[PDB]
Amino acid sequence: ADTFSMPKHYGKEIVRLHYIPLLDDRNVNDQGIDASGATIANGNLYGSSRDVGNITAKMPTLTEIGGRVNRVGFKRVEIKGKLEKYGFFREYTQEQLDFD
Amino acid sequence: MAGPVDNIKPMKYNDPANGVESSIGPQIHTRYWYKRALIDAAKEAYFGQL
Numbered sequence: 128a129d130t131f132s133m134p135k136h137y138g139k140e141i142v143r144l145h146y147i148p149l150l151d152d153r154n155v156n157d158q159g160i161d162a163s164g165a166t167i168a169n170g171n172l173y174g175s176s177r178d179v180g181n182i183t184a185k186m187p188t189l190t191e192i193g194g195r196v197n198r199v200g201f202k203r204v205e206i207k208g209k210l211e212k213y214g215f216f217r218e219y220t221q222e223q224l225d226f227d
Numbered sequence: 228m229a230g231p232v233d234n235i236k237p238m239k240y241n242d243p244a245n246g247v248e249s250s251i252g253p254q255i256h257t258r259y260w261y262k263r264a265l266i267d268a269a270k271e272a273y274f275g276q277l
Contacts, residue, residue: 142255158238200238203252 133210145204150174156200162188163196170200 133141147154149171156170162185173185187197238250244257 144255157236201251205253 139210141208143206143208145206147202147204148174149199149201152176153204154200154202156202158198158200160196160198162186164194170198172197172199 131141150173151171152175154171154174157166157168159167159170161167169185172187173182176182189196241247241249243249243254248254
């Protein structure tokens with residue numbers, strides 16, 4: 128196991144960022160102009176799908192005139208970590224050590 | 228109340244401090260911190276000296 132030294136004046140939580148790739152199902156977005164031009168609710172280009180029929184239907188195709196087609200987007204995620212405290216004590220008397 | 232029609236809608240920076248979050252995702256810091264605190268001045272005494 129590895130040890131991370133938390134700073135002093137920054138609360139009791141740690142936060143880290145995570146970046147999602149393009150072709151992934153966690154990359155939900157709204158930049159969804161399709162191959163012919165239409166706002167659809169899918170901006171990740173069939174991400175994380177291994178079906179051939181589904182794959183050869185969202186491929187980005189281009190015509191000789193170009194145009195506003197095949198837009199994409201990206202997202203982010205965050206993760207957290209926490210802390211806590213522990214301890215215990217013991218007590219005794221003086222005659223116990225002397226007369227044992 | 229706002230600007231003209233968008234008709235484009237790119238990856239923007241919609242106001243995250245209140246309401247609509249963002250295009251990329253969650254933010255860490257949404258405000259700068261003034262590190263010098265504002266302290267009121269002390270009062271004055273007129274009777275102690277006499």
